[PDB]
Amino acid sequence: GIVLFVDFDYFYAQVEEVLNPSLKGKPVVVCVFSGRFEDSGAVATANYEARKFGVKAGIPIVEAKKILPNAVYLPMRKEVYQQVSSRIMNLLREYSEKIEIASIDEAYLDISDKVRDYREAYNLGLEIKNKILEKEKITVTVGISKNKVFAKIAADMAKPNGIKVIDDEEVKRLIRELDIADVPGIGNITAEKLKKLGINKLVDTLSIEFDKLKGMIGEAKAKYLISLARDEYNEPIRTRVRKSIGRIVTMKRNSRNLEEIKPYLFRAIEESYYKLDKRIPKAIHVVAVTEDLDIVSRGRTFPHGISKETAYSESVKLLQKILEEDERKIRRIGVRFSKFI
DNA sequence: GTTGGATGGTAG
DNA sequence: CTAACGCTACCATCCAACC
Ligand SMILES: Nc1nc2c(ncn2[C@H]2C[C@H](O)[C@@H](COP(=O)(O)OP(=O)(O)OP(=O)(O)O)O2)c(=O)[nH]1
Ligand SMILES: *Nc1ccc2c(c1)Cc1ccccc1-2
Ligand SMILES: [Ca+2]
Ligand SMILES: [Ca+2]
Ligand SMILES: [Ca+2]
């Protein structure tokens, strides 16, 4: 059983460079502007040139501009990128039918019935890399391994513009040697709990007792880690099926004023219903981000589909509920539909 | 119990 | 106005419900 993982290089910045070859070689920062002040907002992604200087996803635009003022700042165009994204996701279909599209920029192919061994797998990788390079000018990074988690880890190790195999030998090796905080799904909070426990390596989960580990990092995460370490991890490549559409946005100034807030809430609903496209959701959630970035939400599930009209009235009763039950101002507001028929 | 909803935390 | 864009997926927990 063989899994090939593709993940596009600095994707949005790269699409801008292909849309503007002059930018190539020089720092490019794709950022969302917010409208609260001169350069309010955040960098969504930066090319590798930029990154060398500290400009990366999540930092304030006004900060990035401290560091790199001469650099090129470009407003995000999610729609332009999703189109390139989709063309690429179709080229990959041409190489395997069983494909798990994981994000705007990464997909898992199962290539078991296409290649005989990792050698042929590698070569297919090479071929995929060329094909996406020919037709879309984007460079990707490819990871090949026995399952999804380790094909991802391969890609993480190989990036910019690489291709890397992890054979059943090195899967065994990495279970013993890789920092457990590099295993997909293990972030800062989970890593600091595992260290306290004295678990630094995937193999260490077999030596600790299960109930004690459950106690710390939850059941789901426990099993996942154990399975990885036992070499039993074998979730299949399933087809992407969305469970949530949503859209939440940052207002021009903080407010508690229902009149000031609605136009945001309703532009949120219009885009969500538009993204839904034939999907009927049974549940709606209004989500507020307070003046100090704590996240608060309220919602409702109906026994039937939510019409756009019902979404309106309900989204306002939900927003009110928020303002009633929490007195902080509101910096971002938006909506999330779910539980589709 | 196992299930489902509301809300929230963690991750990518 | 004075820093923090925005997307989806999954799991944990508290807390009725339906036996
Ligand atoms: N707005 C926004 N988009 C993000 C963020 N993180 C990732 N993305 C989007 C934009 C990226 O171009 C796209 C793919 O990002 P990756 O996580 O795969 O890293 P990226 O491809 O941009 O550079 P790569 O060499 O992996 O690191 O996903 C983020 O914090 N904010
Ligand atoms: N707003 C936002 C935050 C994180 C991520 C996206 C959007 C898309 C994406 C893809 C892969 C990893 C992380 C993110
Ligand atoms: Ca990616
Ligand atoms: Ca990427
Ligand atoms: Ca990690």
Residue nearest to atom 1 of ligand 1 (CA): A44
Residues A284, A311: Cα–Cα separation, whole Å:
7
Residue A100 pairs with which residues in a beta bridge?
A108
Q: Which long-range contacts (CB under 8 A, 24 or more apart) does A152-161 make?
A: A152/A5, A152/A7, A152/A184, A153/A178, A153/A182, A153/A183, A153/A184, A154/A5, A155/A5, A155/A6, A155/A7, A155/A106, A156/A182, A159/A7, A159/A9, A160/A9, A160/A48, A161/A9
Of residues A44, A45, A142, A35, the one with CA closest to residue A96: A142
Pair A122, A173 in one domain: no
Looking at the fold, whether A6 and A91 belong to one and the same domain comes out as yes
Last residue of a domain, one of A107, A131, A166: A166
Number of compact structural domains in chain A: 4
Cβ distance A46 to A30 under 8 Å? yes
**A185 in contact with nucleic chain B (CB within 7 A):** yes
Asked whether residue A322 is domain-assigned, the answer is: yes
* Distance, CA of A93 to CA of A110 (rounded, Å): 11
Answer whether residue A308 is part of any domain.
Answer: yes
For A321, the token pair is 């509920």
Separation of alpha carbons A76 and A82, rounded Å: 12
Going by C-alpha positions, the residue among A176, A180, A179 that lies closest to residue A230 is A176
Q: What is the resolution of this structure in A?
A: 3.0
The verdict on residue A238 lying in a domain is no
> What Rg do the C-alpha atoms of chain A give, in angstroms?
23
Q: Which residues contact A106 (CB under 8 A, 6 or more apart)?
A: A5, A6, A7, A8, A155
A152 vs A184: CA distance, rounded Å: 8
Whether A124 and A172 share a structural domain: no
Active-site position among A16, A49, A106, A314: A106
- The rounded Cα A175 to chain-centroid distance in angstroms is 25
CA distances from A12 to A140, A207, A332 (A): 12, 43, 24
Measured from the Cβ of residue A180, the count of other Cβ atoms closer than 10 Å reads: 21
Structure tokens at A214: 């459950």
Residues A180 and A207 occupy one common structural domain: yes
Burial class (CB in 10 A: 0-12, 13-18, 19+), A45: buried
Task: Look at residue A239 and tell me if it is in a domain.
Answer: no
Residue A321: Cβ within 10 Å count: 15
Does residue A284 contact residue A311 with C-beta atoms inside 8 Å? yes
Cα A34 to Cα A37: distance, rounded to the nearest angstrom: 8
User: Given ligand 1 and candidates A7, A8, A11, which is best to mutate, with the most ligand atoms within 8 Å of its CB?
Assistant: A11
The angle at the Cα of A158, spanning A217 to A80, to the nearest 5 degrees, equals 90
**Residue matched to tokens 């920092």:** A179
What length is written for chain A?
Answer: 341
Tokens representing residue A239 in the block: 């087809």
> Can you give the distance from the CA of residue A244 to the C1' of nucleotide C13 in angstroms?
21
How far apart are alpha carbons A132 and A127 in whole angstroms? Answer: 9
User: Would you state the structure tokens that stand for residue A92, as one six-digit string?
Assistant: 């990959």
Residue A97 phi, psi (nearest 5): -80, -50
Torsion sign over Cα A51, A54, A58, A63: negative
Experimental technique, in short, is: X-ray
Candidates A283, A293, A290, A292; CA nearest to A335 is A283
Q: Which domain holds residue A177?
A: 167-233
Structure-token match 């391969």, residue found: A154
Domain assignment present for residue A341? The answer is: no
The whole-angstrom separation of Cα A189 and Cα A217 is: 9
CA of A181 to C1' of B10 (A): 14
A274 with A334: CB under 8 angstroms? Answer: no
Domain closes at, from A166, A190, A221: A166
Residues with beta carbon inside 6 Å of ligand 1? Answer: A 7-12, 44-45, 57-58, 104-105, 159
